[PDB]
């Protein structure tokens, strides 16, 4: 049986590297910070190292480490993400923006030395050049939301579909339909959860002494859904 949860008892350094290409607009992002799974807390600062980010920062939040969610003790059995550590899992998404293009993402989330690394490739396709995304018409925030997890038995992993309602500056909402799949890298044992959900809150800010295009992010992720019974 897996022990991987024992790697997340303290505060763990995080590194995030993303290479992106949306409608031929290429960019890279690097982020560094730390994760504290006992509180379900992530704090990171992201830099667009290629200059100007050509999509809004909120559209990348879900893409830029669910092994740091807080699973309550009566749910430790359903924590797929930590069970696959330190060898990691692959996280793959298709994010379809309604009436606009779609991202396709593939990430490896795994330990490299003492650091939890999230290394991502993103390709974006069929976007409108003066849409809400390439046009930079989204507000700089991310609503709190719940996303349901279900086990993916045939692939030895988990899967999840969920909506993100980005806020447009005119007051409308730009919907981002997420289809997600995770599968382990190593061949060790992994926990296949019962149906539950993750509850997420996000606070986006700016660093006063940072001249480059960037995002300061505080995020909390907490697992819920499994009924407390007779125990």
Query: What is the rounded distance in angstroms from the CA atom of residue 205 to the CA atom of residue 217?
Result: 6
Query: What is the rounded distance in angstroms from the CA atom of residue 107 to the CA atom of residue 60?
Result: 13
Pairing relationship of beta strands 89-97 and 102-112 according to DSSP bridges: antiparallel
CB distance 79 to 163 below 8 Å: no
Strand partners, 123: 21, 104
Query: What is the rounded distance in angstroms from the CA atom of residue 88 to the CA atom of residue 78?
Result: 16
CB distance 102 to 122 below 8 Å: no
CB distance 193 to 158 below 8 Å: yes
Q: Which helix (H) or strand (E) holds 220?
A: strand 214-224
Angle formed at CA 54 by CA 198 and CA 61, multiple of 5 degrees: 10
Peptide bond into 86 cis (omega under 30): yes
Burial 175-210 (b: 16+ CB within 10 A, else e): ebebebbbbbeeeeebbbbeebbbbbebebeeeeee
Q: What is the DSSP letter of 75?
A: G
Resolution (Å units): 1.9
The alpha carbon of residue 163 and the mean position of all alpha carbons in its chain are separated, in whole angstroms, by 13
The yes/no answer on whether domain 4-224 falls in CATH 1.10.3720.10 is: no
Residue among 195, 197, 214 at smallest CA distance from 163: 197
């Amino acid at each position: 049986v897996s022990k991987g949860e024992e790697l997340f008892t303290g505060v763990v350094p995080i590194l995030v590297e993303l290479d992106g290409d949306v409608n031929g607009h290429k960019f890279s992002v690097r982020g560094e910070g730390e994760g504290d799974a006992t509180n379900g807390k992530l704090t990171l600062k992201f830099i667009c190292t290629t200059g100007k980010l050509p999509v809004p920062w909120p559209t990348l939040v879900t893409t830029l480490v669910l092994c740091f969610a807080r699973y309550p003790d009566h749910m430790k059995q359903h924590d797929f993400f930590k069970s696959a550590m330190p060898e990691g899992y692959v996280q793959e998404r298709t994010i379809s923006f309604k009436d606009d293009g779609y991202y396709k993402t593939r990430a490896e989330v795994k330990f490299e030395g003492d650091t939890l690394v999230n290394r991502i490739e993103l390709k974006g396709i069929d976007f409108k050049e003066d849409g809400n995304i390439l046009g930079h018409k989204l507000e700089y925030n991310q609503n709190s939301h719940n996303a349901y997890i279900t086990a993916d038995k045939q692939k030895n992993g988990i899967k999840s579909n969920f909506k993100i309602r980005h806020n447009v500056e005119d007051g409308s909402v730009q919907l981002a339909d997420h289809y997600q799949q995770n599968t382990p890298i190593g061949d060790g044992p992994v926990l296949l959860p019962d149906n539950h959900y993750l509850s997420t809150q996000n606070a986006l800010s700016k660093d006063p002494n940072e001249k480059r295009d960037h995002m300061v992010l505080l995020e909390f992720v907490t697992a819920a859904g499994i009924t407390l019974g007779m125990d």
